[PDB]
Symmetry: D2
Amino acid sequence: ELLPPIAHLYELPISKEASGLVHRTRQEISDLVHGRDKRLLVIIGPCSIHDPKAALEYAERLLKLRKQYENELLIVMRVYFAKPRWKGLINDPHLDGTFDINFGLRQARSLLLSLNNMGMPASTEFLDMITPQYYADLISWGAIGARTTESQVHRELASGLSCPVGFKNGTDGNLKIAIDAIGAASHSHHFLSVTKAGHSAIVHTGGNPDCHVILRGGKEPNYDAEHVSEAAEQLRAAGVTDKLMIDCSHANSRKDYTRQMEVAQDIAAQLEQDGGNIMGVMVESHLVEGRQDKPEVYGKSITDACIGWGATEELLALLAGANKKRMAR
Amino acid sequence: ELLPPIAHLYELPISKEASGLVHRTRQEISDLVHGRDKRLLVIIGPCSIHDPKAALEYAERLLKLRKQYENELLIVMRVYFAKPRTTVGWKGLINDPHLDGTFDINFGLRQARSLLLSLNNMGMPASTEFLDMITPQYYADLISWGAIGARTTESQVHRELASGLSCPVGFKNGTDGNLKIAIDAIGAASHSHHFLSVTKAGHSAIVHTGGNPDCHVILRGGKEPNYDAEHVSEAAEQLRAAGVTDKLMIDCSHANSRKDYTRQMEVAQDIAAQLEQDGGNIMGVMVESHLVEGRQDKPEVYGKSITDACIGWGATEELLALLAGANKKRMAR
Amino acid sequence: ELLPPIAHLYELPISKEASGLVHRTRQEISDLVHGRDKRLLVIIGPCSIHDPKAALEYAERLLKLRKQYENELLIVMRVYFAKPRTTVGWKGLINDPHLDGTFDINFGLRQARSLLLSLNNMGMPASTEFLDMITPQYYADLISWGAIGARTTESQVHRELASGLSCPVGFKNGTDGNLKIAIDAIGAASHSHHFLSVTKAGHSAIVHTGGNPDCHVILRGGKEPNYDAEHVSEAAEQLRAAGVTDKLMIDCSHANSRKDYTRQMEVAQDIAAQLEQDGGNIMGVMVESHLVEGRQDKPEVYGKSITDACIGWGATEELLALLAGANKKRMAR
Amino acid sequence: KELLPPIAHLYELPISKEASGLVHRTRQEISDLVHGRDKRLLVIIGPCSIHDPKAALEYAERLLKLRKQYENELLIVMRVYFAKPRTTVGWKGLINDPHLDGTFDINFGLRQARSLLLSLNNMGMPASTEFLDMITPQYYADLISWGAIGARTTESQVHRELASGLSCPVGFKNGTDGNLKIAIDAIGAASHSHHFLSVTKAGHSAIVHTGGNPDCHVILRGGKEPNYDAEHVSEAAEQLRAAGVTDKLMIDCSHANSRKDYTRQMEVAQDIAAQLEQDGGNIMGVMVESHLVEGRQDKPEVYGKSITDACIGWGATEELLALLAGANKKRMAR
Ligand SMILES: [Mn+2]
Ligand SMILES: [Mn+2]
Ligand SMILES: [Mn+2]
Ligand SMILES: [Mn+2]
């Protein structure tokens, strides 16, 4: 029997400091989206969380670099619960085909609260129409994924979220559908949704003004300067923000997780050469590099493969050093 | 504030005859998807419904042709309520039934259910696009075939939605022409799913679906059209490769028509030719048709579409004879 | 599957006139309760409603008397559905509207709202007894006066209920003549309460009520009757002592009539006599009345109670003329 | 405000294997006493109202030793009453206002209620309560082994309906002025099937079809005069037989049978003891208002002392419990 959001919000209410972090981080991000601050948002963390222990451990380390680089970068953890394909730690938290959604949603809120409490903001992918209410309050940045950027109900969903939202270009490279997504997400909508209490209702939303585009490759990779400058023109054409995010992983690195660093080197070049239209990057990253089918090694992905801790330090310093130079000019 | 499904199911319960017409039409379609019957499913009617009255006059006309071509074609009306916009605009009758930015969703939901009931009661089965996660509980019982649009075919929740529907479901290929996503949608929709949904009583719940065995593909065009025998033949091999039904539907409108209503006949004509040489992979087609041809920004003229432009009634009578005769021959073999 | 109140409200919303009649009848009763108007509230009508048709006819007749005597009396119809049993039996038109043990509650409630709306539209305000905690929401907007019966006057949850009702409320003395429990009840109902209740949408919620200032006591006999002037005077003294309105209602039926429907006229004769004398603490009366007199175990004769025995329509004209005239005199002084 | 449904508390505080076994077993043992199949004496005993779990848990440990020591003469069950009926107004109890300060934090209160009950059952002490609200019972009824319908609600159809659908035995009190018929009638109604509106474990209103509660009985709790003595019991037993219902009954030592004097509960007890020695075949149980510390107070200043009706203290409780055990050992011999 499905518990409503209110049951989880009661056991695990947001603390003052988690509340303050989220509010502050959401704003700080807004500033990057509309070009009021020249720091670089870095959404970095695992492809997917399957072990809360590990995620917290990962946070601790990320925390040191988050504060270390705070004048140049704005580091925020990837806390994605799954990959649209095990459909997650939400849909199946025991990793054994048991589908215990009540436990999953509880565990997800708990991890989210714990990270916000220790100073680490959290981002995630909003896939379902109903699950967001259970932890959206703990989320500082949200992704609508390549497979739903074109869906009306997902643009609706984003139009009512209190955090900035990144729309990915379509699976085969289509950029218009993300630009459209911003236009749709920015305006008011009326639609059916589910309340904190678990009842259906008509919601009226006010529009999300802090949406932006995410370049994640396609038929070919769209991360370089020319690809970025073409994106910027199109965004200016449609009267939406020409500041965008580049996903280092997935279809931009193709089938090689270690190529994340090359893309990052290339973004670093742009930032030292000009890079005016870049406000963020995304990186798939974990304690231990690579992937595995079943979860036997601690802190190594069971979905898409991720760079390991060593390379993450490397990749962050690379970008930190690069963006310091852009902020100077 | 929102009325639950059960409220509409109490005012507008399904009749003995609607129920059988639906059970019957669904089964009849499954057989088309599984090649047990080689009639041609013809999903035909307006782009979107803005006026129940005109849709009831339309249906009465189209029913005469349903009875007349029943050995050759299986005709089912297009009764589209929810509309996917590219950016924005009127999202359909459910979302905004007074056409004036009021968003009287309870009224809209009642109107749609009543129209669909009236249609089954007169003997015209109905088809719609399932776009929202929640609205289907209000009138799925009246639906003989549903579609998942080009824009939502890649979505996991729409796939799960399909997997719990009792009617056959057609997935369209994506807006650029990508066909893999719809092949993948059949894969997923055919399996059992656990996900979150809403009950008849208006509450969120866990639902464990049995999976929908009667799903199929719809070719509706992309960067360039995809209706001809060659494109049909490439798709067919891909379907057999993935080990799912190689029977598919071809849409004559949208990207296959280059968004022009005077090309829909052209497409139907290439389909008739295919049907006459062979075309054993074609189990159905789709056509945007209204009492009157074209479109209009505002609902001024009766029976004229305010969304995509449609062919008129005269042009519809032709298109149907065209396919009726072309398919009789195929069935003769 | 129980439909929420919003479903019934959507189908039978209140009309401008029904709303005005309720609003204004409620205020007129408040006046009578707080001694600002010396007309006599008369709560008259069948013991229980088992036939809406016969109900609507009774109103028509009663409507002509409501206006004739509008200057002396304020006539409001007894439209009780929900009936408390000593043990068990037919609990009412809500709980079992088909009279056959089918317990079709959704239909019952729809029928109850429908009758109430009609009665109001044609100009006859309605009164009822609130027994259940959940069913009030379905039609309380159509109710001008409410009763908490003798068996629940001492119940804390019914006192809480009463604290949130927007219409005046009569508490009866307890089944063996205890009056204190009713005086207490007004104490409770007059205050703010916090408790669990159910919303217009069918969900449990915490409600906070502001208190009902228009409560009063009803004298309905015990082991011995309590209608006469001495008991009336004895009651007023008790009221004034606990700091509540000393304006009360007297039941002419039940333990005051010794469960004999003929004795209802005896009691009204005594009230009439008190009104001619002085009787300044009487603000209303109750009468169990129907088109046809007496009772039956099964609904065979039209307009004849199947519960407690009522006076016929003949005896009604007589009892109203009698009270109308006696109170015209009191009003003169 | 935002009431959590029973499923929320049921999920945080699921009934345990042991609690569940104790509830099933006590409910059955009680049914036996109601229907003249066992001669032990059911003893409902504990504070008038719970205003502090800690004290309630300390109380229970003590009473557990005596439940055990007297298990072959008495069946002991703690009074864990949350909801209270005021004559007019007042604190309605720990559920309705758990911080004691006018805050009506009912979500906290229900979680507190469930936690206490669960802990009580987990430690081997079954629990009884009065069911006053239509909606609260769903939050912890599963942890209750015996229930009470109060004197002020025994004549109410919806409290009879409620009772008809409880899985535990129920005792209906006689009316505040001594009316016994209303309670005999109430067993009548409660033993039959009803259809009525209630609220689900998930928080929605629903139609419920109840099966009937066959283990209802009467409680003599006084009226204008007390009704505990032999003469009153036998006259009650005749009225019960007359109406076709069980002539086994419970006698409340407190409230109108002790005329609101906590020191007379022992006198009542003594009278009951005699009747168990003389014959007493219609008695199946007793109720006592007991606490760690005797008397009462308007504010929860002293620990283990009632803020509602006055209770006898631990000492008098040890005394009263031995007296009854002794006297019932003898009745069980015959
Ligand atoms: Mn990934
Ligand atoms: Mn269209
Ligand atoms: Mn009556
Ligand atoms: Mn007490």
